[PDB]
Design a binder for this molecule. Structure first.
Ligand code: HEM
Ligand code: HEM
Ligand SMILES: Cc1cc(N)nc(COC[C@H]2C[C@H](OCc3cc(C)cc(N)n3)CN2)c1
Ligand SMILES: Cc1cc(N)nc(COC[C@H]2C[C@H](OCc3cc(C)cc(N)n3)CN2)c1
Ligand SMILES: C[C@H](O)[C@H](O)[C@H]1CNc2nc(N)[nH]c(=O)c2N1
Ligand SMILES: C[C@H](O)[C@H](O)[C@H]1CNc2nc(N)[nH]c(=O)c2N1
Ligand SMILES: [Zn+2]
Lengths: 403, 405
């Protein structure tokens, strides 16, 4: 049996046959579905993953079964047999990084997957070098507001030593300062990384939007602190197209969403530092980062400004304030000429992506709870689309925090 | 730590382990290779006895007589009855417990804080389609209660060896007609096109409004279904108006008060009640977001947006989100003014959080289908969005059953 995949808005049905290519198990069993969980509940092993990925590469260049292909498999085989590990060619790494993004079930922006600038930073040998590579990545990806997707790939994990790691979860993060009375100034998601920075000698600020330094770690060395040059970090002040008081709230967000703590696995090799970036979907800022109760949590503030009845849920003050906040993010990014996509256009493009993938691969792994936006869910076409979730490799994965 | 699913709330940082899922007998659609959690419907002898025994064990625990002589005597009586007849029958109080437990077990229901408060009408004596109709009208009158709604279920005779089933053909007790037009479009509710055409094939004289209440197609064992028209005064409806947008009343939208599901199968201890309609009261997003705004339902978003003078030419105006919000407010405001029970999606999800905590203490978990529990607008503004959920099938259960035709 292969999954029957139905779109309930259009009545149309596909069959996912790509899932038969999944070799790693997810959290679910026939007794209980764990799909809404955020976190996961020898040589021949590496060699099978290596061969499989090499097959994937030559197939993609249509040079499958060629001399090139067989000699490459021998190279890989010779290298593992002797050393217990192997190394990728730049063009394989480029193929792998794109494929990991393509395979990411939680990403709504995968229509873009083939357009990814890949920086090879595998010849990096010190935190200092990592920093130079990160600055170049930011500068390239930011591109004065015309954002471009990128990944920078630092040296792979090696059996004999500690990993290269970027301690920060993103390249741009706002500080969160825990108060004597347990409350937080700034971004409560970043309390622990903020405290780590101070401990490693950073002089903290005291605002709501202090950009953090990076903690960069070369193998088996203490992490080192690096302040990002302010001109590298493009920010967008938030105003609303009609509500004049909104600017007065003093809100802002950074242009570049760059994830820096996930592991990139290609052909059984692991890349513990491989930060990647695209551009934001407006709801990530407008809804989650500004309105989550455990984030900046501004809904009440905005509601009171809008003069709404806060005393009762059934006035839908929360819903009304959230909408205006998302509109402000969209307005302000557009005014600043910084790339952003609203949730309607994003989910429409993802639908087109599902269809391209169906034709190209016979399916697409997608995590419904993550694809459907956090406001206006059923107003988007993805709400009504069934989705099958499973792990393909190359993959982006979670990995433990390095402290 | 514990060898049971770890369940996390990301807003509060709190952890639980679901131990109840261990009591699941029935497998769902997922495997280690792939998750099918988002699919709406992915497709006895000793078999009966073990379901029966398990159910009777559940019953005796719920009255704290587990292992008692009354418990062991009921088991023996069920065996003897299955021994000689191939089936058995539930005591009245077993039916009431089993119907509540089916609701309590339903992973897709956000209203389960109310599970213990369910009026169970025993209709296992019913023997004709005319009588089903009387029972149904009684249910509607009782449940509607002039706007002060009361949860209820009416249970008709169980499936029986050889003999044909009791079936209510309609998916809900109240449904608006859907008339396929010459141009391929639909007047009324497109969800109801098929049941509308079945009603006509069976002799109903079709109206031609957007809100025509359907007759009921009721089927008694081994008989062709019969058509019954609900007396209009039994069907409470609420005209829709908006608290400040005066033109919204001019749209002539309305919805009915009573959500009453009529085509699901209630299964208790292996027994199958193929006709067992149940009702509660609406959460406002069901009406204002799904029924009114789905592109494949009334699809009114654009009309409302145009009336609101929004820029419908560009996704990034968020005209959809604005219209949807006002439509939801209209639903809430209009039900409040009409004194008809309704709950908004914030009040509902907060109450479901409380339900989760009660069930954690009572049974060590609660089966929950996240995609269904999280509302269709304002998802992450509700506390359930940030709550991990474990989905599994327990019995007694409400289940889908194929359409009788
Ligand atoms: C080009 C514009 C892009 C958009 C609009 C976009 C959109 C998104 C969104 C909205 C999420 C959910 C994020 C959250 O809720 O925190 C996400 C997740 C993700 N996207 Fe993207 N994406 C983009 C590019 C990329 C790129 C370039 C990569 C990697 C090369 C990527 C890989 C991922 C991954 C791995 C996740 C899952 C993160 C996690 O599990 O926490 N995306 N994407
Ligand atoms: C007390 C008021 C109640 C509220 C607010 C409520 C709320 C809801 C909502 C919002 C849904 C999802 C609806 C949809 O998207 O189609 C639902 C599903 C359901 N509820 Fe309730 N509920 C209530 C009472 C009941 C009662 C009395 C029962 C049965 C005894 C019940 C059993 C169910 C079942 C079985 C489903 C799943 C239907 C399906 O899979 O299609 N609920 N509930
Ligand atoms: C590339 C990209 C584009 C775009 N528009 N948005 C993104 C946002 O991804 C942010 C990533 C980082 C958080 O990590 C979640 C998380 C948190 C924790 C505490 C543990 C864990 N395993 N995972 C949630 N999603 C990334
Ligand atoms: C009792 C109750 C209270 C309340 N507030 N809301 C409800 C909503 O239940 C409505 C029921 C009817 C649709 O059935 C879903 C469905 C449709 C189809 C065609 C197939 C399927 N498997 N499932 C959605 N759920 C029920
Ligand atoms: C528990 C639940 O799965 C969790 O809140 C998820 C839901 N969907 C999400 N979807 C996106 N895009 N990002 C998220 O962080 C989450 N959080
Ligand atoms: C594909 C997806 O499962 C489908 O659209 C679901 C999503 N969540 C839902 N949630 C509820 N409460 N009701 C529904 O009908 C649906 N539809
Ligand atoms: Zn699952």
């Amino acid at each position: 049996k292969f999954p029957r995949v139905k779109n309930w808005e259009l009545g149309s049905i596909t069959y996912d046959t790509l899932c038969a290519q999944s070799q790693q198990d997810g959290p679910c069993t026939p007794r209980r579905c764990l799909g809404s969980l955020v976190l996961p509940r020898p040589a021949e092993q590496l060699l099978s993953q290596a061969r499989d990925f090499i097959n994937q590469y030559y197939s993609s260049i249509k040079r499958s079964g060629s001399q090139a292909h067989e000699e490459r498999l021998q190279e890989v085989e010779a290298e593992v047999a002797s050393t217990g590990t192997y190394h990728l060619r730049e063009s394989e790494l480029v193929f792998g990084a794109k494929q990991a993004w393509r395979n990411a079930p939680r990403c709504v922006g995968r229509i873009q997957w083939g357009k990814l600038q890949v920086f090879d930073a595998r010849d990096c040998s010190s935190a200092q070098e990592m920093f130079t590579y990160i600055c170049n990545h930011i500068k390239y990806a930011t591109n004065r507001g015309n954002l471009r997707s990128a990944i920078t790939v630092f040296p792979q994990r090696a059996p004999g030593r500690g990993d290269f790691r970027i301690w920060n979860s993103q390249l741009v993060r706002y500080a969160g300062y825990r108060q004597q009375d347990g409350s937080v100034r700034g971004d409560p998601a970043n309390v622990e990384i903020t405290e780590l920075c101070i401990q490693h000698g950073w002089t903290p600020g005291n605002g709501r939007f202090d950009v953090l330094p990076l903690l960069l770690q070369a193998p088996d060395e203490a992490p080192e602190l690096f302040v990002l040059p302010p001109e590298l970090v493009l920010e967008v002040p938030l105003e609303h197209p009609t509500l004049e008081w909104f600017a007065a709230l003093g809100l802002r967000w950074y242009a570049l969403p760059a994830v820096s703590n996930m592991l990139l696995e290609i052909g059984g090799l692991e890349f513990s530092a491989a930060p990647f970036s695209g551009w934001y979907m407006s709801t990530e800022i407008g809804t989650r980062n500004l309105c989550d109760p455990h984030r900046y949590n501004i809904l009440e503030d905005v509601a009171v400004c809008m003069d709404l009845d806060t005393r009762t849920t059934s006035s839908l003050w929360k819903d009304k304030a959230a909408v205006e906040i998302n509109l402000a993010v969209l307005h302000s990014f557009q005014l600043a000429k910084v790339t952003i996509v609203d949730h309607h256009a994003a989910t429409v493009s993802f639908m087109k992506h599902l269809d391209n993938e169906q034709k190209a691969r016979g399916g697409c792994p997608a995590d419904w709870a993550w694809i459907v936006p956090p406001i206006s869910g059923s107003l988007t076409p993805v709400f009504h689309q069934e989705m099958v979730n499973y792990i393909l490799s190359p993959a982006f994965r979670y990995q433990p925090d390095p402290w």
